[PDB]
Every structure is written in structure tokens, then in C-alpha cells.
Amino acid sequence: ETLTVHAPSPSTNLPSYGNGAFSLSAPHVPGAGPLLVQVVYSFFQSPNMCLQALTQLEDYIKKHGASNPLTLQIISTNIGYFCNADRNLVLHPGISVYDAYHFAKAAPSQYDYRSMNMKQMSGNVTTPIVALAHYLWGNGAERSVNIANIGLKISPMKINQIKDIIKSGVVGTFPVSTKFTHATGDYNVITGAYLGNITLKTEGTLTISANGSWTYNGVVRSYDDKYDFNASTHRGIIGESLTRLGAMFSGKEYQILLPGEIHIKESGKR
Structure with a gap:
């Protein structure tokens, strides 16, 4: 028998992605020196970003346990970021993923599924995670x-x-x-x-x-x-x-x- 993740909401969301315990970024490159915006901008345009967010969720669940309330909160909240970015991509076709994910007019920590959830997904790299949100919360x-x-x-x-x-x-x-x-x-x-x-x-x-x-x-x-x-x-x-x-x-x-x-x-x- 499975666990229920609550839907993203301002009153339940964590203040940030990964509860500030991890974040979505381009990989550590040993010997590259300091990580710079152009590299992270490209990382967000690529599919690897999707993979990375998902892997991070799995790694977190492994380490901390799936039923731990914090885990379910992180899941809810993180997926929340994706929905928010994808909304912005539907609304502003042609902007980069980095821009849609970081500089949206609606703050990702404020995301409310019940009222903001969209029927149109963007087809960009954020979609697979959006598609999961609709499974969790979209009631078919x-x-x-x-x-x-x-x-x-x-x-x-x-x-x-x-x-x-x-x-x-x-x-x-x-x-x-x-x-x-x-x-x-x-x-x-x-x-x-x-x-x-x-x-x-x-x-x-x-x-x-x-x-x-x-x-x-x-x-x-x-x-x-x-x-x-x-x-x-x-x-x-x-x-x-x-x-x-x-x-x-x-x-x-x-x-x-x-x-x-x-x-x-x-x-x-x-």
C-alpha cells in the first residue's frame, strides 16, 4: 500500500527546493575551477536537468525513508518548482529553461497545484516531472x-x-x-x-x-x-x-x- 504526497500549496511548501539541503545544478567538474553561469544555463537547457532532479528525489528517499514527512514535503515542493517553470514556458514560448525556472513572476515556493495546475504541458525538459505531478495530484x-x-x-x-x-x-x-x-x-x-x-x-x-x-x-x-x-x-x-x-x-x-x-x-x- 502506497504513500500519499500532498499537493503543492503556499501553506505546505518548503521555503526552497531540497529544503536547502540540496539544489538543482550543473555537476561538480573537478579541476574546472569555479562554476559559472553559462555552464549552468546550458545545464538547464539539457535533459540532464530532469534526470538530475529525479535522481535527487530517489537518492533522498533511499537515504531518509519514503514515509518520513520531510521526504514527502520535499517531493511535493521540488515537483512544485517544475510545474512552476513549465507553466512559465507554456505562457512565454521561446524563453530559456533557466529563465523560466529562476525568474518567473510567480515565486516557485508559492506554487499552488489546485489553483495553478495546467492542462497544457510545454514539451520541454521540465515536462516529465510535470507529468508525474499530474499523476500524483491531477485526479485523472x-x-x-x-x-x-x-x-x-x-x-x-x-x-x-x-x-x-x-x-x-x-x-x-x-x-x-x-x-x-x-x-x-x-x-x-x-x-x-x-x-x-x-x-x-x-x-x-x-x-x-x-x-x-x-x-x-x-x-x-x-x-x-x-x-x-x-x-x-x-x-x-x-x-x-x-x-x-x-x-x-x-x-x-x-x-x-x-x-x-x-x-x-x-x-x-x-
């Missing part, structure tokens, strides 16, 4: 993330209909309309954590030249309307951490929409 409400925000990289050669035309040795212009399974976790550790394997529809044009050069121009959208967030659908190193934390704490599974479309232009030779 639908969330969504726009397909243009998830870092899709499509290889047309791994799409059966396309591969076939290319391998067939034909030349000219060919219309494509197909559905495929796409493993986000194979290359994207962030999107892999909370979306994993998705189903996509694409429609477009394959152009093959006499010497085997091909170009695919097309549009990609989600084929399934929504995707489950549960222990089984996580993929990748971040996902595995979500699974371990999910198994320890009370919450509800819920579904994530993937509205939107992207336009792709990929190329190769046969």
Missing part, C-alpha cells in the same frame, strides 16, 4: 501537449510504405498516406519518458531521382487521439525513474492529448 484529468513541441525526428526509411517505394527502384513523384508506430524513446529521452511509443499519421509526396536521391515532403499528425500515462508506457532512462517513483506513491493514471501537426522535409539516397 486529461492533459495535452502539442505535437509541434515534442522534438519529433522522422526517418522516412523506417516507414514501411516509404521504404518500399524507395527500395522498389521507381523514379518520379509518389503520393504517400500511411500510419506508423514511432518510438520517441529511441532518440528523445524527454518525450520518451511520458509519451513513449506513439502512433502517427503522415500524408505527403515522395520524390525519387534517377540516381536514387529521394525527398519526402509531408505533414505528420497523431493517429491515436490520446496516450496513457502509466508505468507501462514510459520509455527510456527518465521513464524508468518515473516508474520507480510512480510505484511508491498514490495517484491516478490519466490521458494525454497530442493535437496539432508538423510539416516535415527529409532526404536520402537509395
